[PDB]
Design a protein around this ligand. Structure first.
Ligand SMILES: CC/C=C\C/C=C\C/C=C\C/C=C\C/C=C\C=C\[C@@H](O)CCC(=O)O
Length: 256
């Protein structure tokens, strides 16, 4: 049967995901819901902030923090992409294009794994910065993360685990609707059996979660929105802070 072929694919992607991302959702949840060995230091104010620097501008200093981290995620995501069957065999220009557009959608999908209603894990889970402390930041920085939490709280309500996420982030990267794609066909063919792999995976892994597959695909809309707001807000910074530098890798990704 072909089902056997789809599980092998599901398994392969899961193995690669674990190899590419150091902080999985399983670990993240273990830390958030916990355990005495995985307990994080919590940052909820400026004092605990300067206290946190030990154990582990202001709004700008953390903004650069996210920047460096996002660059790391891009690297990890790029490494995972190469493992998707057929990906590296596609035209180079498109490989670059698929990455340029899928990286941020994937970053916010996985960032949810490190979030709960109250805040978000940092420094590979050694810390936990409160949602409120982030919202208290001088504008426009103060409202950089709120849209992520709102998305996270509802995305997390689907109760997906890592083996599920591995296939879904792969489906995201292999999107034949990306601006500027040279050969949409071979890309669509790959996503086709990836979606087939996802459908079966959700059915077996969540036998009683009616239409999770359809529900999860609709979430691909919420991600689009998030990216846009982030980009607009980003344009504001570059003008209000002509003295703050932005990483090249991230600048080339935003030409959009
Ligand atoms: C030690 C890091 C301190 C705080 C981290 C808190 C949140 C960051 C968590 C994940 C990073 C993902 C997105 C960061 C949010 C906005 C990023 C602003 C830019 O700069 C870089 C983001 C980008 O454009 O990719």
């Amino acid at each position: 049967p072909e089902s056997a072929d789809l599980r092998a694919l599901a398994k392969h992607l899961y193995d690669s995901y674990i190899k590419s991302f150091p902080l999985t959702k399983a670990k993240a949840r273990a830390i958030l819901t916990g355990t005495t060995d995985k307990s994080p230091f919590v940052i909820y104010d400026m004092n605990s902030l300067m206290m946190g620097e030990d154990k582990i501008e202001v709004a700008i200093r953390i903004f650069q923090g996210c920047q460096f981290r996002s660059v790391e995620a891009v690297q990890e995501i790029t490494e995972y992409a190469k493992s998707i069957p057929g990906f590296v065999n596609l035209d180079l220009n498109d490989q670059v294009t698929l990455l340029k557009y899928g990286v941020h959608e994937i970053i916010y999908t996985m960032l949810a794994s490190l979030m709960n209603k109250d805040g978000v894990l940092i420094s590979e889970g050694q810390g936990f910065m409160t949602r409120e402390f982030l919202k208290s930041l001088r504008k426009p920085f103060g409202d950089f993360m709120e849209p992520k939490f709102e998305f996270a709280v509802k995305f997390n309500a689907l109760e997906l685990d890592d083996s599920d996420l591995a296939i879904f982030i792969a489906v995201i990267i292999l999107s034949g609707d990306r601006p500027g794609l040279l050969n949409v066909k071979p890309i669509e063919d790959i996503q086709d059996n990836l979606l087939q792999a996802l459908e079966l995976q959700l059915k077996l892994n969540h036998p009683e979660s009616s239409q999770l597959f359809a529900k999860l695909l609709q979430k691909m809309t919420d991600l689009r929105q998030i990216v846009t707001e982030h980009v607009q807000l980003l344009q504001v910074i570059k003008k209000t802070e002509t003295d703050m530098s932005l990483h090249p890798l991230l600048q080339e990704i935003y030409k959009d």
